[PDB]
Design a protein around this ligand. Structure first.
Ligand code: BPS
Length: 344
């Protein structure tokens, strides 16, 4: 069987099972989304599509635009090097030092931080979701400033380009695929340039990108990766029709991901390498961006703790008016598959 797919620049068992051959053994082959069909990464508008990535796009799709297109198969928390980075030679060493400083943030993050979404509700799915992706920077800045007893009104918000948030339709359509290596090439190099421009004092970085940025001679004012309140819940979705019509296929898919997740625990280097190749980053940055032992946490989850993390992100979206009505996670989830896999 053939399924179209994609994954965000996050640790996940779908990519792992695919690259390690577990899916092939299960008689499943995945075809990654081309840049020309890239919007599906945000819209889920395909009959046999599966994605494992950030939770914001699917939450918006299910809760704001097209309820019912997907079912949730599992969750894999994400937490690693994260925060507002400054050059090593910057006199800024504590959160309090950010007072009155120039914080580079995406236009999307500025809308959220200002509490002024503008035309948000009128935007097409792609641009609309990109506004919501400004949430990473927004929450990170709020948490960071709390450390110095500061608020958003105590700093200068300066518009800059942020990876994954600023993705023009032309860039997407011109990209070979939605793999990080194609869509997000040399992120750290670009962020290092912003910090060297003399017009910004700090900017937000995370994922392996933060690992490579750090290597250029930069550091986070506050490493948000050290506090779980900065974690996100990567979600694994599949077209709802497959769940209802081809449960056998979905079960084989989930079984393969679980086996791949178990296998990953004893093949850390291979898992690091396949993620590094997929994202187009150094192998060392993967561990920094996802956590040193992320390979031990690849078996998908649907336990209450995992669902609570997903709910936490959903609440940030609701509070900030990015979502008006919440997605019923228990209804969205299709726990029977993962449950059957773990009971083998
Ligand atoms: O949750 S998202 O998939 C996501 C999560 C983390 C980093 C990048 C992206 C992304 C943004 C735009 C297009 C493709 C990926």
């Amino acid at each position: 069987d053939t399924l179209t797919y994609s994954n965000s620049p996050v640790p996940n068992a779908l990519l792992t099972a695919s690259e390690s051959g577990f899916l092939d053994a299960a008689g499943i082959e995945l075809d990654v989304l081309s840049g020309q069909q890239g919007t599906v990464h945000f819209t889920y508008d395909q009959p046999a599509y599966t994605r494992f990535g950030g939770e914001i796009p699917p939450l918006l799709s299910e809760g704001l635009r097209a309820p019912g297109r997907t079912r949730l198969l599992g969750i894999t928390p994400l937490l690693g090097r994260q925060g507002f980075f400054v050059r090593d030679d910057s006199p800024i060493t504590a959160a309090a030092d950010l007072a009155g400083r120039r914080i580079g943030v995406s236009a999307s993050a500025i809308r959220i931080l200002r509490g002024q979404l503008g035309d948000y509700l009128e935007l097409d799915p792609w641009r609309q979701t990109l506004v919501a992706l400004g949430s990473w920077e927004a929450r990170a800045l709020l948490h960071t400033l709390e450390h110095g007893e500061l608020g958003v009104d105590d700093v200068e918000l300066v518009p800059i380009s942020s990876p994954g948030v600023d993705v023009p339709a032309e860039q997407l359509e011109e990209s070979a695929t939605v793999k990080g290596a194609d869509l997000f090439p040399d992120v750290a190099r670009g962020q290092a340039a912003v910090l060297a421009s003399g017009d910004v004092d700090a900017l937000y970085s995370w994922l392996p990108w933060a690992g490579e940025l750090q290597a250029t001679g930069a550091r986070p004012v506050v490493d948000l990766g050290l506090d779980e309140r900065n974690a996100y819940a990567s979600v694994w979705t599949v077209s709802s029709g497959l769940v209802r019509q081809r449960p056998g296929l979905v079960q084989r898919l989930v079984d393969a991901a679980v086996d791949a997740g178990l296998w990953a625990r004893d093949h850390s280097d291979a898992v690091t390498s396949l993620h590094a190749a997929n994202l187009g980053v150094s192998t060392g940055a993967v561990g920094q961006g996802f956590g040193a032992d992320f390979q031990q946490r690849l078996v998908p989850r649907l336990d209450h703790d995992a669902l609570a993390l997903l709910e936490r992100t959903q609440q940030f979206l609701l509070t900030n008016n990015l979502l008006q009505e919440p997605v019923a996670l228990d209804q969205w989830a299709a726990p029977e598959f993962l449950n059957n896999s773990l009971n083998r």
